[PDB]
Amino acid sequence: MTEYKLVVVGAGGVGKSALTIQLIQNHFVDEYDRTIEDSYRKQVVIDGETCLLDILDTAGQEEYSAMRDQYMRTGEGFLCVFAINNTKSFEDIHHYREQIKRVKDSEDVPMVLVGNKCDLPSRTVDTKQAQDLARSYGIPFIETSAKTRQGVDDAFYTLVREIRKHKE
Ligand SMILES: Nc1nc2c(ncn2[C@@H]2O[C@H](COP(=O)(O)OP(=O)(O)NP(=O)(O)O)[C@@H](O)[C@H]2O)c(=O)[nH]1
Ligand SMILES: [Mg+2]
């Protein structure tokens, strides 16, 4: 039974924690408190093969880098998350992708681009613009909402498929 170490990266506030909790625990966190755990695990079936998802939820604050850059070497696939109502977080995708390629020392790292908060009306990042950037990187692009769970399973499952394709 194969285990996949998935790393969720992105700027502060894009919903890295909310996506991980919605996937693992099936509820949306917002106003109320929550217990910190960082490491989340789940058994899933993807394309008829049962596997274990080991998800690392990193912090967006760049002053805390001993938690994110340390585990960039251990991660097998990366969820690069921006929020569709946060132009700066979309711009920052380039910075996270370069940091990953530097640590992994590879041009073909399993990655999925994720535009979160697609339930909100205040969009400032066009879908076609993010599709164009993902095409430039050669990676899938998935729009998600941790609030409604739209696209959440697809984003993490697509990353696993990228990892499986890379391991051939
Ligand atoms: N409307 C909406 N709000 C969302 C969505 N995902 C997250 N949020 C909200 O956005 C805020 C930040 O979410 P959070 O998961 O803490 O973001 P983060 O990327 O883990 N932040 P950090 O980098 O500081 O750890 C919260 O108020 C959360 O409820 C979404 O899909 N839709
Ligand atoms: Mg968080």
Domains annotated for the chain, with CATH where assigned, are 1-168 (3.40.50.300)
Taking alpha carbons only, the member of 66, 56, 81, 47 closest to residue 4 is 56
Ligand with minimal distance to 81 CA: 1
Provide residues with CB under 6 Å of ligand 1. Answer: 10, 12-18, 29-30, 59-61, 116-117, 119-120, 145-147
- Ligand 2 centre distance from Cα of residue 119 (Å): 19
Q: Strand, coil or helix: what is 153?
A: helix
Ligand with minimal distance to 61 CA: 1
The resolution, in Å, is 2.0
Q: Which atom of ligand 1 is nearest the CA belonging to 145? A: 31
Determination method here? X-ray
Task: Please provide the DSSP assignment of 1-40 as one string.
Answer: -EEEEEEEEESTTSSHHHHHHHHHHS---SSS------EE
Cα gap 92→86, rounded to integer Å: 10
| Contact by Cβ (8 Å): 84, 120 | yes
Cα gap 47→93, rounded to integer Å: 29
> Residue whose CA is closest, atom 11 of ligand 1?
13
Q: Which residues pair with 2 in a beta bridge?
A: 51
Among left, alpha and beta (phi > 0; psi -120 to 50; other), residue 149 is left
Q: Which atom of ligand 1 is nearest the CA belonging to 146? A: 31
- Ligand 1 centre distance from Cα of residue 119 (Å): 12
Measured CA angle at 64 (ends 134, 105), to 5 deg: 45
Cα gap 26→148, rounded to integer Å: 10
